[PDB]
Amino acid sequence: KGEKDIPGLTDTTVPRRLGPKRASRIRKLFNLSKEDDVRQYVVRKPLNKEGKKPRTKA
RNA sequence: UACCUGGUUGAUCCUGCCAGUAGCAUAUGCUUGUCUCAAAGAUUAAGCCAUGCAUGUCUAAGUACGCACGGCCGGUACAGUG
């Protein structure tokens, strides 16, 4: 990147969906030791659609 | 059912072939009411091919973060069907 902002590209940011799934890749992104529960730090997709209940998928 | 019969001469006896006769298989003609099985683009061109179909596959048990549905309970790693 230079110094300006191109309006079609740079100013937005994407939610990079689908976090890590293998239990070693969780600890590489969150820096857990052995005694930390990996399932404490799992990413949950904030799922939402009209006409339906708010659901959360992991 | 281990079979013969007409044809050479004025007449005869033979050699001998032609012709008939009976199946069986391919075609074909004329005809064809019922009923049971049944072959069927081999022969000529292993010639040429429109179109469509003829090879796919998930259990409890390889991989599910598709809400595509719905379901507890909403900090519940993953309910489930898929």
Side-chain angles (χ1 to χ4, degrees), chain A residues 3-35:
Chain A
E3 83 273 14
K4 298 190 169 181
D5 263 347
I6 308 183
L9 300 152
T10 321
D11 51 74
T12 79
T13 169
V14 73
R16 279 177 182 173
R17 51 192 261 180
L18 296 184
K21 178 176 158 61
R22 183 195 287 176
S24 170
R25 310 250 191 196
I26 302 284
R27 320 202 194 102
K28 203 207 287 184
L29 187 142
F30 276 143
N31 299 314
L32 310 189
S33 89
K34 182 54 72 180
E35 297 91 0

Side-chain angles (χ1 to χ4, degrees), chain A residues 47-58:
Chain A
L47 203 59
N48 42 2
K49 192 200 276 190
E50 70 270 12
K52 270 131 192 172
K53 293 189 177 179
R55 195 48 68 156
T56 295
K57 209 180 282 174

